Amino acid sequence: MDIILGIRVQDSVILASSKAVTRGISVLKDSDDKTRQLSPHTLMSFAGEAGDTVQFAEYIQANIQLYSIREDYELSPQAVSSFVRQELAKSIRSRRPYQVNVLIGGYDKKKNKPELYQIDYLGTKVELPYGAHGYSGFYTFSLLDHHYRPDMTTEEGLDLLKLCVQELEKRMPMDFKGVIVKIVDKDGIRQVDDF
Amino acid sequence: MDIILGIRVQDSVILASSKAVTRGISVLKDSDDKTRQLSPHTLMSFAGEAGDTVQFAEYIQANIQLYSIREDYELSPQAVSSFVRQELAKSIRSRRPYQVNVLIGGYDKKKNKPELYQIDYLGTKVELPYGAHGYSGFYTFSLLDHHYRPDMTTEEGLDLLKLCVQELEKRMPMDFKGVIVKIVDKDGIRQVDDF
Amino acid sequence: TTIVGVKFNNGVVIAADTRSTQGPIVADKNCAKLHRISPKIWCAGAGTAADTEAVTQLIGSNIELHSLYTSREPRVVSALQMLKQHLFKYQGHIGAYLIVAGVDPTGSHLFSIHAHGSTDVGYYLSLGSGSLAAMAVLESHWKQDLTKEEAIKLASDAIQAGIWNDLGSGSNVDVCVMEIGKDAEYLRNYLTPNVREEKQKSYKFPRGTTAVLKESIVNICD
Amino acid sequence: TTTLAFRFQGGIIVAVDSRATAGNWVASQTVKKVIEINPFLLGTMAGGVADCQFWETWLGSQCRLHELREKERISVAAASKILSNLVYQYKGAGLSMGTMICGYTRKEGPTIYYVDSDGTRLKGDIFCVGSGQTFAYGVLDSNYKWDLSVEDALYLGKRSILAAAHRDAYSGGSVNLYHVTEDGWIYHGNHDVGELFWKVKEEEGSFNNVIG
Amino acid sequence: QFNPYGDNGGTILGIAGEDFAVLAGDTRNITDYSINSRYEPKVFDCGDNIVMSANGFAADGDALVKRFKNSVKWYHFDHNDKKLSINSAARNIQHLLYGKRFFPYYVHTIIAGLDEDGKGAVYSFDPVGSYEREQCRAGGAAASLIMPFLDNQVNFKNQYEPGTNGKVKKPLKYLSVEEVIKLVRDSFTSATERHIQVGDGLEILIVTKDGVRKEFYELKRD
Amino acid sequence: TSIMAVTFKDGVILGADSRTTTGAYIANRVTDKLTRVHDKIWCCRSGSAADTQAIADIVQYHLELYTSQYGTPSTETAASVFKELCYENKDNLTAGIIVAGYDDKNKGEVYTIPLGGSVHKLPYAIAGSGSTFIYGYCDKNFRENMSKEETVDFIKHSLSQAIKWDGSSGGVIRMVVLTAAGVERLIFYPDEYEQL
Amino acid sequence: TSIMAVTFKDGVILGADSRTTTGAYIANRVTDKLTRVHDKIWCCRSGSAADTQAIADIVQYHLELYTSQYGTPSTETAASVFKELCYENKDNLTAGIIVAGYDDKNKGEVYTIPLGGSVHKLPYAIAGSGSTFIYGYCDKNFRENMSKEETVDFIKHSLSQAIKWDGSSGGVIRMVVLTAAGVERLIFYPDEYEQL
Amino acid sequence: SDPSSINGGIVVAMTGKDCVAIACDLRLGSQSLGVSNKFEKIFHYGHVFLGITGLATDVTTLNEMFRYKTNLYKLKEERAIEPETFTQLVSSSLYERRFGPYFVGPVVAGINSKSGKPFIAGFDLIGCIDEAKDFIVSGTASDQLFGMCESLYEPNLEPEDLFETISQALLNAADRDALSGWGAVVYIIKKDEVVKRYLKMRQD
Amino acid sequence: TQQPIVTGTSVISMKYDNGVIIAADNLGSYGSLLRFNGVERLIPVGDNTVVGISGDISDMQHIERLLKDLVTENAYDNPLADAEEALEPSYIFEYLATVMYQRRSKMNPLWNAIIVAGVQSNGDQFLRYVNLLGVTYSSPTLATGFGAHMANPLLRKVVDRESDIPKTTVQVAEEAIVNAMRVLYYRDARSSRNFSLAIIDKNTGLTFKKNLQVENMKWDFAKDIKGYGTQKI
Ligand SMILES: *[C@@](C)(CO)[C@](*)(O)[C@H](Cc1ccccc1)NC(=O)[C@H](Cc1ccc(OC)cc1)NC(=O)[C@H](C)NC(=O)CN1CCOCC1
Ligand SMILES: *[C@@](C)(CO)[C@](*)(O)[C@H](Cc1ccccc1)NC(=O)[C@H](Cc1ccc(OC)cc1)NC(=O)[C@H](C)NC(=O)CN1CCOCC1
Ligand SMILES: *[C@@](C)(CO)[C@](*)(O)[C@H](Cc1ccccc1)NC(=O)[C@H](Cc1ccc(OC)cc1)NC(=O)[C@H](C)NC(=O)CN1CCOCC1
Ligand SMILES: *[C@@](C)(CO)[C@](*)(O)[C@H](Cc1ccccc1)NC(=O)[C@H](Cc1ccc(OC)cc1)NC(=O)[C@H](C)NC(=O)CN1CCOCC1
Ligand SMILES: [Mg+2]
């Protein structure tokens, strides 16, 4: 875990998530996908404590998929984010809390708008034009404050994202082995293979 | 600091030392030379506590240079390594010890032989065909156990060294921003600029 | 806090200051520390502010239900028994230090309760951070066979000692007089010896001083 | 604190914020974090205020004594090493300093040295130091080229502090700008973030996260 | 284990005008929840038209003032009775404080006077010697209450010219000694209301080219 | 506290000081540490005021319910109930209780129950912080089958010394006399006992 | 330890038990806690055996050097030297010393020096762990200007009670009589004092 | 790791002549890192306004909880809850979590629709009601707010004057606190109109 | 770094029209054990100053020796040692204040709270406090330990500010001090009944009263207190 970013542009939400899984002094894997598709137009990236992350992601995934089958209907990104926040808000006062931070990128088909939510392990939800968890934010927020515009295209968003990854690769102490980038828009979720 | 390696081959000693200087969540510099020339045919690399490293290296450098001027003669690598060990052996029982680990690569002109010494902050000296300090050793020693031969050339030693750096870049958690490589032989000390 | 209780001829009087603190900051300059458990049983509370209010309301609620069940006016010893058993059960974690007083068919009474659940009996008592300042006055001026007006004077004087000399107490003096055969009279702000002086200047700003970015009407209706 | 200084075609830019903090209490908004050692040397301050203020002033006295004794202005390397050797003597005692010794001499040219309280001393072209260093790095790195004009370099330095002033809770107040040339340092004014932010937002079109 | 430090409470305040400067401080001295003295001055005339106050731990405060007063005395002996300028005093105090960097004087120090151009000057220090000249500074227990009020009323922060769309700031201007004393008195009465360690009395020392004048005002004693 | 209970010819007498402390501050200088759990079974309370109070109230309840079913309980029975509470809750209690009662068959009896919750039947018992200072005196002066006036003097002199040396003890000396005649309360003020 | 020193008509008597403990083990059951710092100035030692020993030896040295120059030192002088050592080294010492001596001008004198290193001149003094149990007894029984036989009985009965209750005290009761006549050592065995 | 000062923020409420004002900053951070500049801390249930400072997750949770409770109240009572009653509901709900509390500093503000009286109230994290004629403060810059309010405030201010006073109180307090600021919102509340104004403040 | 062993409790004092009064009980406590009963904690210096000391008694006895030595040293080569160059209360205090602060700064304090009461050569009343931390302050009434919490409130009812001092007589002042000593005996668990009192007047000089006792105590109401709540017997 470690680096997860998110950028909402005019017509899409773009999520970037590091590929490294490190344990001790060994990088065990360099192709890890730190994300789950909750629904056709909703993607969730995650970072935090080992084990907790995937266990939580898949648990949320199962619940949203259950809802979809029951109602034959897709929950809005806002509704999914509120469900996720409440689960984390319960968790923090449990015997053993989930130590997982998430970004939820979705395209609301009723509003025809992209939406990005940042939720930490305490259950602190905020809707944002761009988001980050962990130490990444200390570089990317100021960078995006400068270069981000609300009316950008998906291509402009990807170039803006390349600028973030370059900065992180230059100044971050750890080798996070690049990122997997995914785009969420009106046509659903797709992965950029060459980044 | 962090990664310092050393390989003794047939006719030379090759020292590789990482270029990164990290402090907190920021890589402050990516072109740092973690070495000092003690004498024309003796090079010392170093790694450890911030401040201590350079302060110790330059202190040793000044003493060896003083000796050279006084006697109009170059101390053997064995003699320099023994001097360095004793300084660290004093240091460990001081009020505030030098927390510095060093490798000393030298070419003995009287014996016409390359010599590599590994000395830790406690003052633990060993002569070796190949050496490493810190977490690097946990990968490089086994690698060199397999691929190293005592009669290798300087070029073969550099290829053997490339194999170590590649392994470290693949499996080490931190980005150490590559290495500066230096060769110590009968003609003195020179730096490989393209590594 | 500073709180006191004083017995007299035909009843009992309790008093309290009106300062509430958060560390060195005065949170409330005129809070009410005198609490009604039943019409003629009143409680002065020091310690954790929420705990004194919550524990006094709970027992007060149960006392009302008990009074209705038994068709009798509630007794001070019942409130005392219920409070102490509740506080003891929580091993001091409910930080309520109370002076319980009142009149009932048995007579007039005065008790104190500590957070861990121990109770005392006395003719004069004081609790809180300014209890030593108050008790010094009570030990100096108290006597047997006090009148109503003498006991009020003694009680308020003991509170004043806390107000002036204790940093954890200040502002005003509240009093409650519980006399036998009469209605209890709650004297909110009986003394107000700490009125703020006129300010030197009016800090009313010229309209338009504050820079505004947006305006909008908020909808409160359905 | 957020302080930076970077080398470029036209010399050195040095930019700092002006906030001082005691925990979450904002102690000052008008603090001076650049100390003018001589007409060709500057020192930036980050970390303990007293530590920085006291020892960099002291550094200035040592630099003056050098030029009296040697009849020559002290080198940037020698000036930085006086400070680094001093704090190394105190290593462990609890001094808190992140400083940058920026200046020009004939033998060196424009030079920047990072010096901190653990005894680290580094020569380099770009550094950002302070609690908000990462925020400054983000903007500075992503816009830096060697061939920046004096006008563009001054703005980038100013804009990088503004970026950090905005995001970092323990940075802010105002931006102090300096430009170091072969002829010495030149002050380029105090710029209050109270006005600068809105001016930059409007003119540049940036800071879209903020309610306009 | 022995704790060499203590907290004696109180608060101080310095404001600079065009041709004058004031240094105010309450006269209350405390430990924990007890009042030690209702009138214990901590603002002192140190000679050469310099007034000084070191608020926090009184033992360290008195020690510092004593050492600085002595520093002024020896400055005269060593430099032919030359007047110690306020800027020179400030630098001297930094060295006094930083001299004990690893066993600090637990005090927020403020000095006031006139600069070498005759204009009002206030300097303020942290416990280990960092200093800065300002128009305005509150120090001590109630510094966090008073300082933002001073930002607003002395430096006109967040105040814009009415009708200018929050584009033109309220222009900076020097305040008259009458206006400054109004702000000091209102600052201290406000601090007295909400801070338990502040009260009893207010003593203001005013510094002009003619010398050092004093003014005293009663504060609430609760 | 300084407390004691002493058996004698006609029954038993309980004795106690009247000081309650919160640190070095005296929260109550007129405390009643002698408490009734039954008509002629009383106890002296030392240790935590809240703990001993809560215990005594539970015991008083148990003996009231015992009396309703089986008639007057023995002093031994009362001590057993105290023990049961003190022993089973030893980890959460700080209570040193002396139990004293008068039967007509068994006459005067004294049981002491220290911190651990053990039971010890004795001719007389001393307890509380101030008892340490009078072990020597009480051992030398106690005699079996004393008269009422002798036992009152024995307790008065003993507690006077305990009060004199122990800062945690003081105020008045309360006493409770348990005989076939009935229950008698006695009080003795500083001006009398201090100059013994 | 239980130790005491008592002034009387003809001079002063020092008394002590003979038990030394290392935990609950008795390292020495025949200890001599009464030690000579001068011909007719002696001390009782309580607290750390090593500390009190090292102090007494330094005092004995000081008084021997005092006597060589200025003649016989007063009992007050001896107490002052003990104080000086105990007070100045209070952080590194655990010593409770009673100093007792006989002058011809001042007769019998007793000075007690507790942990802090303060000095207190008294008619009699008690100290050590076992003294706590006899404050009551000793206060009630002590009289000024007692005879030798009365003072010996007072000390014997007192230490007997201290020994009885204190586990850290026991063995024999040693005594040292300081009068104009000279120095007399007394010993009293368990079989005598236990059944007092 | 002090729950009440991880995210930061402030709320202040004041009374005027036949009106009340309640204001809050917009910052949400994670210690030094500023994360959001749109995080409003004032909510309303009918005509009763509630501001909440402290740990942001609990701010959100309590809002959702009081919306829940006031909705059921209205369905059963067939009327909007009043400020005095809502104040009691807040106190009950907070004390219910006595030994595992919400790390919050709530502030109630509104006008009783029956009597027309302006009402404000404050609470600690554990439920203790703090009623006031003049003003209530809450958050990481409470000391600053206390000082600003105590000096600037005067009774019976008109809605337009009250706006200036409360705004200047919040702004100058926020500027002396590292964890507060990044924008501000002020609600002016009259008997049957409510005006919401966003303030221009320094963004550092 | 110390811990106090044998300790003395409250010292109380106040100013009146012509001079100052100071008082302190004669007890030397050893924790909860009330060990020593003949301890004098008021120490006169000359005929114009009394130093009252609470806290550690070994450190008190050290301070006694210092004051005793100060008198000796002041007399050396001083023909006016009993006249113009006699030790003033202000000199004695400043000396002690210096020592106290120096010892705290060396992390080895004299574990005491000290009140220096006296009358200056010009007739002015002197009353000032100093403690183990080197903290100093002055007030019309001063008290240490429990005295600060219980005596000061009572003494301030007589002299609440500077202007009340001329209006207060020695009879009224002593009465308040003696009353305060009684209150402390009721409520302080480390206090004794026996105490000493000293009056330093600008006309009548130093009057040192020993072996005073607390009297006129109210204990009779105790007979009426039964149980802790429900007990009727
Ligand atoms: C005086 C003022 C104490 O200084 C009184 O005891 C007073 C009693 C009182 C009763 C009813 C209404 C108002 C006031 N107590 C307080 O004002 C009290 C002081 C206090 C603070 C912290 C404590 O923790 C051990 C105990 C007492 N102040 C409060 O209770 C304030 C309003 N609340 C808090 O500070 C929140 N605390 C509550 C306890 O849990 C931690 C957070
Ligand atoms: C930004 C604001 C983050 O701190 C900067 O680093 C700033 C740097 C600076 C340099 C010169 C002039 C002004 C400002 N640093 C501070 O403002 C600094 C933060 C800090 C506090 C304490 C530290 O010790 C661990 C280190 C850094 N603030 C101060 O120095 C404040 C004004 N003073 C104190 O906290 C007083 N302390 C200092 C340490 O000794 C005890 C007393
Ligand atoms: C003498 C005075 C001291 O041991 C007695 O034992 C006395 C017995 C007594 C007092 C009143 C009524 C009946 C019997 N005990 C006390 O006065 C007692 C001292 C004590 C406190 C706590 C203890 O451990 C839990 C042991 C002894 N005082 C109190 O209980 C007072 C009312 N409360 C406090 O001091 C506050 N305590 C609460 C418990 O936790 C520690 C703080
Ligand atoms: C009675 C027995 C207990 O207090 C006396 O005080 C007795 C006095 C004595 C004994 C022999 C000769 C002259 C006087 N003291 C001891 O027997 C003493 C107990 C004691 C030990 C350590 C202390 O703190 C430092 C205080 C009291 N016993 C010893 O000194 C024995 C010989 N040694 C040990 O127990 C080992 N100690 C060494 C010191 O550190 C702790 C372990
Ligand atoms: Mg007060």
Ligand SMILES: [Mg+2]
């Ligand atoms: Mg034995």
Ligand SMILES: [Mg+2]
């Ligand atoms: Mg900021």
